[PDB]
Design a protein around this nucleic acid. Sequence first.
RNA 1: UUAAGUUAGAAAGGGCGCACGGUGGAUGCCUUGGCACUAGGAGCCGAUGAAGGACGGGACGAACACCGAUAUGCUUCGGG
RNA 2: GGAACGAGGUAGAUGAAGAGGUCUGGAAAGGCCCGCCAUAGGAGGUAACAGCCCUGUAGUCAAAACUUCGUUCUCUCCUGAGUGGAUCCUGAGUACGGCGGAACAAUUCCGUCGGAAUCCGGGAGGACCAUCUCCCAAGGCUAAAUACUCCCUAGUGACCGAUAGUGAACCAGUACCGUGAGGGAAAGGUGAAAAGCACCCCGGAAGGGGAGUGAAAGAGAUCCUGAAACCGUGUGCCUACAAGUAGUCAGAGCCCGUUAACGGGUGAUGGCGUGCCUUUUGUAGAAUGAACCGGCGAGUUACGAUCUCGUGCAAGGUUAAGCAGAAGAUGCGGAGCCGCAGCGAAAGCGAGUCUGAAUAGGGCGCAUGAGUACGUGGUCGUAGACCCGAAACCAGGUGA
RNA 3: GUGGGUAGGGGUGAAAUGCCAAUCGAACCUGGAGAUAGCUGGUUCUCUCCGAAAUAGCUUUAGGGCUAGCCUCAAGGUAAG
RNA 4: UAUCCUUGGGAGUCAGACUGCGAGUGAUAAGAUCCGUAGUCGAAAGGGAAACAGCCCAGACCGCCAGCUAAGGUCCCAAAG
RNA 5: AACAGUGGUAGGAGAGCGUUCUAAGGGCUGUGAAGCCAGACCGGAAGGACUGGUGGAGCGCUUAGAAGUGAGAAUGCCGGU
RNA 6: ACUCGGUGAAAUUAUAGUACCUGUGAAGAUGCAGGUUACCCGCGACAGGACGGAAAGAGGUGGUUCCGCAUGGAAGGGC
Lengths: 117, 118
Amino acid sequence: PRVKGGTVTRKRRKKVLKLAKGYFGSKHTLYKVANQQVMKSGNYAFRDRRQKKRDFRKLWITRINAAARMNGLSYSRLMHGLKLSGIEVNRKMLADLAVNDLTAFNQLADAAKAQLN
Amino acid sequence: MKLHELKPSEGSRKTRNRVGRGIGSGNGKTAGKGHKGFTNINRKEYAVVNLDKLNGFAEGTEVTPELLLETGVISKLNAGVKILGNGKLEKKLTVKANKFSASAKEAVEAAGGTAEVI
RNA sequence: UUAAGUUAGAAAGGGCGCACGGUGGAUGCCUUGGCACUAGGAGCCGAUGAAGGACGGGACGAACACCGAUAUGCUUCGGG
RNA sequence: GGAACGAGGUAGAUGAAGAGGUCUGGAAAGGCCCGCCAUAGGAGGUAACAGCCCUGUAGUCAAAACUUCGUUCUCUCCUGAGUGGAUCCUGAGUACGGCGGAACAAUUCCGUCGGAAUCCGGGAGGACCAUCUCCCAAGGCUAAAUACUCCCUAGUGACCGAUAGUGAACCAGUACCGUGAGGGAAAGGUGAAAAGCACCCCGGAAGGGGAGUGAAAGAGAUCCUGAAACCGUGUGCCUACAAGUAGUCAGAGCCCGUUAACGGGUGAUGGCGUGCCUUUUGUAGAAUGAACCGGCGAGUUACGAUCUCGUGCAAGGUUAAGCAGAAGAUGCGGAGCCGCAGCGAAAGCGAGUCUGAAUAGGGCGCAUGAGUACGUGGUCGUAGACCCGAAACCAGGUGA
RNA sequence: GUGGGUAGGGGUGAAAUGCCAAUCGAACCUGGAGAUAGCUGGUUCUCUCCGAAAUAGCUUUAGGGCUAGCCUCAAGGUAAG
RNA sequence: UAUCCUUGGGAGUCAGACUGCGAGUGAUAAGAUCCGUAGUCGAAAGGGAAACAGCCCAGACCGCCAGCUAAGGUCCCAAAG
RNA sequence: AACAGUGGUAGGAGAGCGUUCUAAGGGCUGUGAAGCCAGACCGGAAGGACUGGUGGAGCGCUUAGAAGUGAGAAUGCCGGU
RNA sequence: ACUCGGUGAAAUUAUAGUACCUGUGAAGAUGCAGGUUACCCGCGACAGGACGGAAAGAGGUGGUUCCGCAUGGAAGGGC
């Protein structure tokens, strides 16, 4: 027997066009360009889910460097001292919080200073 | 077996492979084909009934070309029946074949049955 | 009041989302028409003018259908 | 050559049983609670899905007149079997031979010349020469079993359902194109019922707003449903120092409030980021294609070969055409097919057998049995053979 | 001006492209015919396992085809590599 | 250390590109010229060389706002002397 | 459970998702079917529900069977813009 | 041509918020890297780029007992 088919095509294209909501101009209207943009977005999302982990560490290092130079050390010397004291278990992220929310963390910088002698 | 619970025998039916219906099936664009790429006039041919066939040839006392075919032991009688020395036929029984072999002859004569030749 | 600094808001028009319409005939239901066969019929018509047509026929326009100056019908025999 | 009986065809007739109650509803054939008919539960219609509402269906009948068949009467016509075998017949330029082409010892066709026998007679069994075996040429006529359907009647589809199915569901071989032969479209849907909008108002009209009909008027004449491209009106957030395959990750502010979910919309700023397809050693390219949206658009079927899996039976396994039977299953039909042993060209023998003097060597084959009938799937071959797309050649015609 | 003639392996009478209905180095229409093409373009849902080659020898071989090399699936040998 | 042999089914592939070693080759340094020989791309994303098919490091089942390193780096762009 | 593994073009193998129809069983639906529109739901993918609107009469579930079986590219064909 | 009133096409077209320079790069960079410039939107001109189109170069001898035409002779045997 014969099979026509219109419903499956309409639904499958509408799903993509709904995923392309918010794009500029023709890229939320026409199926052919919306499909391309959705594929590009998938690739970008994967790549940037890796780059996010890359970037937050960079931010943390910058803030630690600033708060450490507020004490007479540099980032490298402070990290070496912290590791040399076993207290280094403390992260970079948690360190950075204890730099915008409790600069009384200088205690840690004092410990690193004591160990660096 | 009810008409709403029909089950095939496991492994008897395989789904046909439909080629050219998307790149996710492995057979997409190129569809699995990849890129561009001395006789005689008449011969007498006797049938064969080895001694092993006659081994336990209970069938009939007289092993006639008929019985042979009638019972079924021999099928197409073709040119004629020929007993061949292969097997250890062991029972009191007469025989009637068109041609014999040396071993078949000595076996039937050591058995004790008749070995007449058409 | 002066000086030096910070910010806000602005829409001629435009972008995204939403609400509401227009145009256009996909889609879904449907069938007046097709397609492939089966079982029987029947396998020719014509000089006593065929097949196929032209022109005409209605109370009142054109066309289809039906009919032929006896022209939208005549006679008979049946059915109803 | 007619005449009587029977069955058909070409009109038709008759034909059982529910307004059951009740609910929703515009409408009941639907739901729930009850009954009936059935040789009739095929089908269509009716305001929604009907056996009992209508037309009908099963079963019974029915023909003045034309026809199609049978049966009988009538009608018409009509000898066979023997004994012999004295004597005649049994199919004339034929049977056969040459001569050329044709066809192609050659083979036949046709012509081109010839040219027997004839019962004690001839012709055949690849040639000729003999044995035997079958037949009787040179005159004519014959139904049935088979082939196909432009048509008519009754039906049937794991056939299409308006870009499909006929080119044509609609005034289709039409409209159009061509001098002509010829080529050849598009185009279905109000509503159950026109009940198809009296009347009032704006307007020259078209078209609207009320009123009215209707279940629905956003069902009002290309009048079921009505998607996308495309075109607009209103509004929440952002936007006039900014350089971009337009997204993605981080992220304030503002506006909302969901299939309550580590919610939705928009996004000032920061990082990263050279479309899709085809092709190529290699593409972002100055390789190729696509204006956009929608529909349609490509590995099938038949017959062979082979391999795997499943089922049945197994040294055996299986029927074909036909007959009967709803276009069915099935029953019978065993002719035939494949396998159960090989070797040698053959000759013949045979778990061996050929070659070779070889019991030399060598080759093959037994030397531990599994095939067969169907079905699914993979691949190969022949058919237009996955789809689209040349230049050329031939046949019959139409055109100064 | 009007009415006519010559037709396609032909005409326009051998010597001329100037052509025969937008067609002419052979007109047009229908059929053989869904011709043939080793050339060109395309071949539509998803995930899992494994995963190449672009090297040698022939083909009147001509970017085409065949045999080796390299991939995958199944069954056996088994432990050889 | 787990591969490799046979049989059977199914294939794709037949202009490869660049880089480094040699020193087979102008055997020497070669360039050549091919010859070998290894790697990568083809079929491989990620980090480095500003950008960069073939160079260097290294082979992406998927999430995490966790840690240690490779090549390469630590004045600012831009993480770290 | 303990290890080990999971880049991939040609290509080989495996497991599935959807569409039309048919058969059997079970059902929906005028207190509103298919189709269309919207949404912040569910699954590893193809996909599947649930609510609201429009629509105004048919549709789907389980197990099998058969295919005119899934479209983004052919300077595709037809329509609309 | 230009402004105003009326009417109203076509080639082309992957989407596009589409600067310049120096490099890099499979052909020539708008879209790659680094830098330098630039408030938003139009109208009329130019012909620079226009990856616009035009162009155009360019042997005998010699073995066989195999079968044998229904039957024999008479013919003919794989190698």
